[PDB]
Amino acid sequence: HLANTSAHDFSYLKFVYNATDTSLEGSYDYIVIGGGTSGCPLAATLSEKYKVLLLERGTIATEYPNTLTADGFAYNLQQQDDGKTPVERFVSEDGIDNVRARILGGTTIINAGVYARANISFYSQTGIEWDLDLVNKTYEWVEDAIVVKPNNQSWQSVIGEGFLEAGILPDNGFSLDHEAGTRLTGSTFDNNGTRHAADELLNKGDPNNLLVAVQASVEKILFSNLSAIGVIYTDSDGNSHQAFVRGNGEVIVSAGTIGTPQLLLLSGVGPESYLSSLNITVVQPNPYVGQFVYDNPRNFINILPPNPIEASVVTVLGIRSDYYQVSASSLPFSTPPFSLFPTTSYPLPNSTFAHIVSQVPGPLSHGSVTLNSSSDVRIAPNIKFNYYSNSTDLANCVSGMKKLGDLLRTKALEPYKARDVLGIDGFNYLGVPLPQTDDASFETFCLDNVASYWHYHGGSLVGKVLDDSFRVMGIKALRVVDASTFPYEPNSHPQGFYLMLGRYVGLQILQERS
Ligand SMILES: Cc1cc2nc3c(=O)[nH]c(=O)nc-3n(C[C@H](O)[C@H](O)[C@H](O)COP(=O)(O)OP(=O)(O)OC[C@H]3O[C@@H](n4cnc5c(N)ncnc54)[C@H](O)[C@@H]3O)c2cc1C
Ligand SMILES: *[C@@H]1O[C@H](CO)[C@@H](O)[C@H](O)[C@H]1NC(C)=O
Ligand SMILES: *[C@@H]1O[C@H](CO)[C@@H](O)[C@H](O)[C@H]1NC(C)=O
Numbered sequence: 001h002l003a004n005t006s007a008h009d010f011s012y013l014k015f016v017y018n019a020t021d022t023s024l025e026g027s028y029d030y031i032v033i034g035g036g037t038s039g040c041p042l043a044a045t046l047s048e049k050y051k052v053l054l055l056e057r058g059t060i061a062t063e064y065p066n067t068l069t070a071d072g073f074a075y076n077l078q079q080q081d082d083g084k085t086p087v088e089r090f091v092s093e094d095g096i097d098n099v100r101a102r103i104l105g106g107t108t109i110i111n112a113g114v115y116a117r118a119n120i121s122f123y124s125q126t127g128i129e130w131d132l133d134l135v136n137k138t139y140e141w142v143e144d145a146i147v148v149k150p151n152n153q154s155w156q157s158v159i160g161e162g163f164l165e166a167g168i169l170p171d172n173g174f175s176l177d178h179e180a181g182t183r184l185t186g187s188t189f190d191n192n193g194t195r196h197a198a199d200e201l202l203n204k205g206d207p208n209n210l211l212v213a214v215q216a217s218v219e220k221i222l223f224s225n226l227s228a229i230g231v232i233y234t235d236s237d238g239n240s241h242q243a244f245v246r247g248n249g250e251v252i253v254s255a256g257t258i259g260t261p262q263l264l265l266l267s268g269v270g271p272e273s274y275l276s277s278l279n280i281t282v283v284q285p286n287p288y289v290g291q292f293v294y295d296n297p298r299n300f301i302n303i304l305p306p307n308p309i310e311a312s313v314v315t316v317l318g319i320r321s322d323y324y325q326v327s328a329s330s331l332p333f334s335t336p337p338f339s340l341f342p343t344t345s346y347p348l349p350n351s352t353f354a355h356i357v358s359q360v361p362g363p364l365s366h367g368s369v370t371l372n373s374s375s376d377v378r379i380a381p382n383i384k385f386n387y388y389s390n391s392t393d394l395a396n397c398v399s400g401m402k403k404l405g406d407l408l409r410t411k412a413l414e415p416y417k418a419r420d421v422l423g424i425d426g427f428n429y430l431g432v433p434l435p436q437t438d439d440a441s442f443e444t445f446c447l448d449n450v451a452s453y454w455h456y457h458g459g460s461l462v463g464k465v466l467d468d469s470f471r472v473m474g475i476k477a478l479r480v481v482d483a484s485t486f487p488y489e490p491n492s493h494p495q496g497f498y499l500m501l502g503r504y505v506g507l508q509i510l511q512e513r514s
């Protein structure tokens with residue numbers, strides 16, 4: 001039911017082409033925009049029966065070898081964004097540094113590798129009529145390709161012992177399920193540290209039916225009884241290209257929380273007063289495109305143990321309904337990995353350190369995506385998350401930070417203290433330590449020291465922009481499948497859900513059509 005350790009499988013490169021190739025232009029059964037977490041498994045699934053074009057703005061992961069190992073994770077965030085790199089840097093209007101992927105495989109090529117299935121209650125909360133047996137079969141299809149049971153890592157075992165001592169019960173052992181308590185979960189990093197990612201799911205596609213264009217920047221959805229008929233995309237030289245769908249085929253947007261609402265607005269799908277104010281012709285009025293955009297808060301402390309600890313990838317989770325906690329151990333660095341700390345002016349560690357983290361669930365706070373340019377998709381849109389605008393989110397951070405307090409007080413973490421004193425002032429901290437234990441100091445700490453968890457979602461919600469089949473309401477032959485679709489996180493680590501969702505919706509399209 002799980003993958004083995006093995007090299008990153010690039011066999012699919014036999015059907016990957018440069019978008020400069022004009023022989024890609026023409027008619028397909030399906031066009032999928034964004035070769036990411038959802039887009040890759042979706043395109044692979046549709047290609048079992050139909051001719052599919054997958055368009056990805058980034059290049060291939062072979063160009064950036066530091067994307068293919070666990071110990072390259074920080075390198076990709078440290079690297080300057082020259083417009084070509086797998087990591088695109090942005091800053092939310094809240095002032096918090098963030099990143100998104102620009103690469104075939106999408107955010108699975110740059111992420112922290114943690115694999116989990118959705119909270120099994122999530123499906124019924126959505127009110128979508130899911131095929132739940134098919135959901136589970138689709139999880140196994142992903143897991144069998146790219147997920148391993150992780151090997152023991154000393155720092156992760158310390159943290160898991162600490163979560164258990166701090167009252168994060170029960171002990172769930174090794175499990176992929178989002179459940180209360182402490183567990184070892186799966187990883188898309190194998191036991192040799194090789195990264196596995198959504199691009200490898202292209203290997204499950206039919207190589208006679210699937211074509212992938214890289215460095216393909218999709219600029220516009222073309223429309224006809226309003227129907228999507230195609231896309232315009234530009235290549236890395238700046239020349240324009242067109243592709244179309246035929247007969248009962250469909251265009252699917254899988255361009256992510258940021259890319260999907262951006263392309264919909266650029267194509268005239270969006271709020272009538274907003275688009276009219278930019279002189280963008282309205283093709284389909286919908287007041288919710290780019291609305292309900294969410295970023296779960298990351299709050300953290302950093303400890304500097306007096307003896308070196310061994311670097312680890314996150315595999316051990318401490319889950320409560322109101323906070324989701326993990327820790328990674330890291331080598332020091334002299335270039336900050338962009339967005340690990342919320343600004344570039346954060347003190348850098350001189351020794352090995354443990355990043356100890358809590359994630360707010362939901363979140364309930366939301367903002368929006370708006371266009372920066374009314375014409376050029378390569379210009380990043382504006383994004384604002386309104387961190388802690390909702391007081392329930394602030395209340396949940398307070399609970400998380402008190403639990404990190406309990407964690408630092410465990411026998412498990414005592415050996416990582418610099419001074420054998422009774423209190424948590426015995427640790428050496430990088431940045432702001434935890435507080436005083438009245439609510440007000442914990443609130444200040446939460447508000448002042450917030451970072452992105454990187455699990456941002458929304459902007460094209462089911463119930464707002466889409467129906468229960470992921471169709472853009474009012475438009476034939478157009479769907480959206482990616483993290484733009486749900487307002488609340490399906491779990492602590494949603495890559496597993498969006499990998500599954502790509503294939504699941506592909507199977508629903510194939511069934512609808514049969
Ligand atoms: C640094 C980081 C670490 C993370 N760690 C974890 C973790 O360990 N585990 C976990 O579960 N989750 C993690 N996440 C979250 C998870 O990886 C993402 O939520 C998920 O991958 C999003 O999938 P998506 O398909 O919505 O977007 P993406 O995977 O980003 O796919 C969208 C794709 O569309 C492309 N694109 C965008 N616009 C266009 C356009 N106009 N034309 C063509 N292509 C376009 C992009 O280049 C990209 O490849 C992490 C996120 C980040 C940023
Ligand atoms: C596509 O071709 C152009 C030259 O026309 C080149 O500059 C670019 O690097 C190529 N991209 C890829 C992904 O091969
Ligand atoms: C799906 O798998 C989960 C564990 O991830 C299990 O709890 C659940 O019962 C399964 N549901 C169905 C419909 O098989």
Ligand SMILES: *[C@@H]1O[C@H](CO)[C@@H](O)[C@H](O)[C@H]1NC(C)=O
Nearest residue numbers: 274275276277278279280374
């Ligand atoms: C939209 O175009 C009208 C002219 O038709 C102009 O008066 C107005 O300033 C334009 N607005 C923008 C933002 O371009």
Ligand SMILES: *[C@@H]1O[C@H](CO)[C@@H](O)[C@H](O)[C@H]1NC(C)=O
Nearest residue numbers: 119121125178179180320321
């Ligand atoms: C799972 O989701 C359900 C319903 O939304 C919620 O009651 C529960 O708290 C969640 N479980 C965990 C451990 O997050």
Ligand SMILES: *[C@@H]1O[C@H](CO)[C@@H](O)[C@H](O)[C@H]1NC(C)=O
Nearest residue numbers: 370371372373374380381382
């Ligand atoms: C576009 O982005 C710039 C620089 O990030 C920002 O400050 C400016 O206000 C934005 N312009 C529009 C039209 O949104």
Ligand SMILES: *[C@@H]1O[C@H](CO)[C@@H](O)[C@H](O)[C@H]1NC(C)=O
Nearest residue numbers: 363364365389390391392393
């Ligand atoms: C927070 O979200 C809740 C539930 O979704 C919403 O009803 C409420 O208006 C928000 N609260 C605040 C403090 O804005």
Ligand SMILES: O=Cc1ccc2c(c1)COCO2
Nearest residue numbers: 074112327328330337340355
């Ligand atoms: O950049 C290196 C690094 C160090 C610690 C860490 C993470 C990344 C992700 O989050 C959790 O902890």
